[PDB]
């Protein structure tokens, strides 16, 4: 796997420090999980702040956390989770699915075109179908997941990917439908990981 | 040969624009049909438009549709969602189109300085958005979006896709 430097490239320096704006009424569990994953792998300086946009953030949210990455979470009254970078030639990045993809990419694991796209496809299913979705659509998503998870331990293969992080996390924050067997197995395999159950209990 | 079946009744313009831009780089067939299916290999298909775009951009590396670095790739992911979620709704269009306008104020193409999946996705989505067509009709389109939209529209690939698929 690729080192952090070559992953970010020329501006490793620019991107080493990450800022995320999140709404306390809608904390992005997927990012919390990914923060935990990053900390296991990298030396990470983390910080929480509270924008004047909001008042009375609960404590767990407030206490939710020579380095390699800087990682600042700001509670704010934003309509959508948003990541900003020091380079501001670029646009702010909106949507936890997109931020999660970037963060997961920091681990430098290589994927061919098919597998990388399959991973992206699962993140979109989480964001575009599951999260704001119908009950009926949710059952269809479950069927599709159930089929994939009958063929491999994780959504996109033999390794954990951002597909798993995002889809598991979204599933926790919507709460109904019968959970099929492969999905149940996968759910407990996810929750068995410290980064996952740790972040989840934070949101209590 | 990769093969893309399309919903002929409602053509995925974004995907067809991507095909038009990668077709000299990778061999692709487009077939008439009633749904969108990119047939990659025997056990491998993609049926959602954004996955179809991503796969084409990934396999046609010389076309440069997914940007040239991680930050650009990320920005392109941002715009692919923006079109799928904000620009695909008619609720809140004014704020959405204004946001697009502001991002375009200092840019010629959405990401970097060349055509990317972000332009293809946002342009196609805009073109099929009724609120956009209404703003154009009423001469109320925001300046930067109008400028960017017209520039792409005039390009050869876009004209070609339009001739082959516009009703």
UniProtKB/Swiss-Prot annotation, chain A:
PTM text: Phosphorylated on serine residues in response to UV irradiation.
Annotated effect of mutating residue 95 to S: In a lung cancer cell line; no effect on proapoptotic activity
Residue ranges occupied by any GST C-terminal domain in the UniProt entry: 106-201
Region called Interaction with TP53, residue ranges: 58-111
Subcellular compartments: Cytoplasm, Cytosol; Nucleus
One term under GO cellular component: cytosol
Function: Required for assembly and stability of the aminoacyl-tRNA synthase complex. Mediates ubiquitination and degradation of FUBP1, a transcriptional activator of MYC, leading to MYC down-regulation which is required for aveolar type II cell differentiation. Blocks MDM2-mediated ubiquitination and degradation of p53/TP53. Functions as a proapoptotic factor.
Extra facts: Accumulates in brains affected by autosomal-recessive juvenile parkinsonism, idiopathic Parkinson disease and diffuse Lewy body disease.
Name of the protein in question: Aminoacyl tRNA synthase complex-interacting multifunctional protein 2
Organism: Homo sapiens
Record lineage: Eukaryota, Metazoa, Chordata, Craniata, Vertebrata
Gene this protein is translated from: AIMP2
Portion of the full-length sequence here: 105 to 320 of 320
Swiss-Prot record, chain B:
Localization, UniProt: Cytoplasm, Cytosol; Membrane
Oligomer and partners: Homodimer. Part of the aminoacyl-tRNA synthetase multienzyme complex, also know as multisynthetase complex (MSC), that is composed of the tRNA ligases for Arg (RARS1), Asp (DARS1), Gln (QARS1), Ile (IARS1), Leu (LARS1), Lys (KARS1), Met (MARS1) the bifunctional ligase for Glu and Pro (EPRS1) and the auxiliary subunits AIMP1/p43, AIMP2/p38 and EEF1E1/p18. Forms a linear complex that contains MARS1, EEF1E1, EPRS1 and AIMP2 that is at the core of the multisubunit complex. Interacts with TARS3. Interacts with DUS2L. Component of the GAIT complex which is composed of EPRS1, RPL13A and GAPDH.
Domain notes: The WHEP-TRS domains are involved in RNA binding.
Function, in words: Multifunctional protein which primarily functions within the aminoacyl-tRNA synthetase multienzyme complex, also known as multisynthetase complex. Within the complex it catalyzes the attachment of both L-glutamate and L-proline to their cognate tRNAs in a two-step reaction where the amino acid is first activated by ATP to form a covalent intermediate with AMP. Subsequently, the activated amino acid is transferred to the acceptor end of the cognate tRNA to form L-glutamyl-tRNA(Glu) and L-prolyl-tRNA(Pro).
Clinical condition linked: Leukodystrophy, hypomyelinating, 15: An autosomal recessive disorder characterized by hypomyelinating leukodystrophy with thinning of the corpus callosum. Clinical features include motor and cognitive impairment appearing in the first or second decade of life, dystonia, ataxia, spasticity, and dysphagia. Most patients develop severe optic atrophy, and some have hearing loss.
Protein family: In the N-terminal section; belongs to the class-I aminoacyl-tRNA synthetase family. Glutamate--tRNA ligase type 2 subfamily.
Protein's UniProt name: Bifunctional glutamate/proline--tRNA ligase
């Amino acid at each position: 796997a690729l080192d952090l430097n070559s992953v970010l490239g020329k501006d490793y320096g620019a991107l080493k420090d990450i800022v995320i704006n999140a709404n306390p009424a809608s904390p992005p569990l997927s990012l919390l999980v990914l923060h935990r994953l990053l900390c296991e792998h990298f030396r990470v300086l983390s910080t929480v702040h509270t924008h004047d946009s909001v008042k009375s953030v609960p404590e767990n949210l407030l206490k939710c956390f020579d380095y390699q990455l800087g990682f600042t979470l700001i509670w704010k009254n934003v309509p959508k989770t948003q990541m900003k970078f020091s380079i501001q030639t670029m646009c702010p990045i909106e949507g936890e699915g997109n931020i999660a993809r970037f963060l997961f990419s920091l681990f430098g694991q290589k994927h061919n075109a098919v597998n990388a796209t399959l991973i992206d496809s699962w993140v979109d299913i989480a964001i575009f179908q599951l999260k704001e979705g119908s009950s009926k659509e949710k059952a269809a998503v479950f069927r599709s997941m159930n089929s994939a998870l009958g063929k491999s331990p994780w959504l996109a293969g033999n390794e954990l990917t951002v597909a798993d992080v995002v889809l598991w996390s979204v599933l926790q924050q919507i709460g109904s439908v019968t959970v099929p067997a492969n999905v149940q197995r996968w759910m407990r395999s996810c929750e068995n990981l410290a980064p996952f159950n740790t972040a989840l209990k934070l949101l209590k | 040969t990769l093969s893309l079946t399309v919903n002929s009744g409602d053509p995925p313009l974004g995907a067809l624009l991507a095909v038009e831009h990668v077709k000299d780089d990778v061999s692709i067939s487009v077939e008439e049909g009633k749904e969108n299916i990119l047939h990659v290999s025997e056990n491998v298909i993609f049926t959602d438009v954004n996955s179809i775009l991503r796969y084409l951009a990934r396999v046609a590396t010389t076309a440069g549709l997914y940007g040239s670095n991680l930050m650009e790739h990320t920005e392109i992911d941002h715009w692919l969602e923006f079109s799928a979620t904000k620009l695909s709704s008619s609720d809140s269009f004014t704020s959405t189109i204004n946001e697009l306008n502001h991002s375009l104020s200092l840019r010629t193409y959405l990401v970097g300085n060349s055509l990317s999946l972000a332009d293809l996705s946002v342009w196609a989505t805009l073109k099929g958005n009724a609120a956009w067509q209404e703003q154009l009709k009423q001469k109320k389109a925001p300046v930067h979006v109008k400028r960017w939209f017209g520039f792409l529209e005039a390009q050869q690939a876009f004209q070609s896709v339009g001739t082959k698929w516009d009703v």
